[PDB]
């Protein structure tokens, strides 16, 4: 009944365009930049990226991990604060109320989440800059209204092979069952907390249920986005396939399927983390529920 990893916490900025994760590469835009270096492979006019793209994105990623590493002192502050609210035995050692200690969790949690953003603010402009350098680089293609779609649909074929490698329904019925068994106990404690006069364990259960909710909606959020990614590129394969498009439409294309794939890789990374986090939180509530029903004397 102790949480050793709090990587499930995340925050997006006021743009709602940048979602910061504790897992590498912290920005889904990094995966999109990796996919563009595979786009410049097939085009002879912009093969210079393979040298200029790697030197640019690698420093953005290295600064992204540097930014999140600064908040480690604040990361451990709430990692040790939820270990007190989760464990009644560890809570019975300190000498402060549950509400007074719960406000320390909330205040220091926002400090940790807010730190992840403030340290990455100057990186938010660096992503916009590389996006521009990617768009302007595509202007060097020796086409105007005759740009070739061959490489555009080659990546579509490869992406749907990579997307079937993940079992979507395995994640879908997992969270549906865990959410059904989550609200079960939420609507349950509220109906039995008055029969058993025990405030130490039930307060710890409601808190571990509060974080269980947050982790769940983070799972359903990333689950939809990888579902939306898979459905959209599938329709691109089942849709019209012209041989020639304007140079601006091709830039729309690479940015479309490039972002579609980065959301898939970013979601699949956090979905597996949230899975291991949900089961760990559920193991805590299950055993502190057994202590509530195991001592009827």
């Amino acid at each position, epitope marked *: 009944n102790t949480t050793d990893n709090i990587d499930y916490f995340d925050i997006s900025d*006021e*743009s709602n*365009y940048y979602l910061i994760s504790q897992l590498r590469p912290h920005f889904s*835009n990094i995966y*999109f930049f990796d996919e563009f270096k595979r786009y410049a492979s097939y085009h002879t006019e912009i093969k210079r990226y393979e040298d200029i793209h790697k030197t640019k994105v690698n420093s953005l990623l290295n600064e992204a991990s540097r930014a999140i590493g600064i908040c480690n002192r604040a990361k451990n502050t709430v990692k040790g604060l939820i270990n007190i609210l989760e464990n009644p035995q560890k809570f019975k050692t300190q000498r402060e109320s549950y509400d007074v200690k719960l406000r320390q969790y909330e205040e220091k949690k926002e400090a940790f989440r807010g730190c992840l953003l403030n340290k990455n*603010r*100057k*990186n*938010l*402009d*660096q*992503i*916009k*800059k590389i*996006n*521009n350098e990617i*768009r*302007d680089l595509l*202007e060097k293609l020796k086409c105007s209204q005759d740009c070739q779609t061959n490489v555009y649909f080659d990546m579509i074929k490869i992406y749907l092979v990579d997307f079937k490698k993940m079992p979507y329904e395995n994640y879908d019925t997992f969270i549906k069952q865990y959410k059904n068994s989550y609200l079960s106990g939420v609507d349950m404690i509220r109906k039995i907390e008055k029969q058993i006069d025990n405030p130490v364990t039930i307060n710890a259960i409601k808190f571990t249920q509060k974080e269980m909710g947050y982790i769940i909606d983070r799972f359903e959020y990333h689950l939809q986005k990888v579902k939306h990614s898979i459905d959209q590129v599938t329709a691109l394969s089942d849709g019209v396939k012209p041989k020639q498009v304007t140079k601006n439409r091709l830039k729309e294309y690479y*940015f*479309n399927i490039g*972002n579609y794939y980065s959301i898939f890789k970013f979601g699949k990374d956090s979905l597996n983390m949230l899975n291991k986090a949900l089961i760990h939180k559920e193991k805590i509530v299950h055993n502190l529920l057994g202590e509530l029903f195991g001592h009827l004397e």
Partner: antibody
Amino acid sequence: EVQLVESGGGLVKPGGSLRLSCEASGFLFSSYSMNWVRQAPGKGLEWVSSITGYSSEVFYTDSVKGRFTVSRDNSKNSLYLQMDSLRAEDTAVYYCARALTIFGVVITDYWFFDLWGRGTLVTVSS
Amino acid sequence: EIVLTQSPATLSLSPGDRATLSCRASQSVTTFLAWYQQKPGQAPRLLIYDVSNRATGIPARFSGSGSGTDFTLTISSLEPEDFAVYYCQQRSNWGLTFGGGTKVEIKR
């Protein structure tokens, strides 16, 4: 309403210094780059300097390099231009301009100017 | 500095005519050129970004063309409002430079 309101213009002798302000409202100031464009009386547009969304990078025109400085306070939705060691050729109407940013599948911008302010007059003469 | 020359320095046409203004650059700026419009006592107004893309809200009569060094702003049929000064501007290389601007005026 979306607007840019300049401030702090005036008059100073050669070698003096002034600080121009610009208060934006109607949009999220942090997501846009900002610029300063000046126009001499009866003459054309000259770009002065630019700053990115979160002060990650700043740029200047050669004529003011080493004399001017740009800063922004996203908490106060404010853009600043510190003009030190002013010269006669600095007499112009200074404009606060917003960089044209596009919100599509990703955020991208151009080094053009889609939003302007009324501007303030800066006169430098002995 | 990448200078932008805009000759003819001024045009004298009437409503209904077609104004075709030019902007030539010293170095090549690819297609990273913009067009502005400025009336007396007002701020400039963005018309076109990256040669041929119209800004939001401005009428469709404004067209854009050109690549490399020679560029063209085209007004299909002028309106009483369109009479003002038009500046070109490049964003390719640092030291952002404007053109000399050319004023279109009513012919009488």
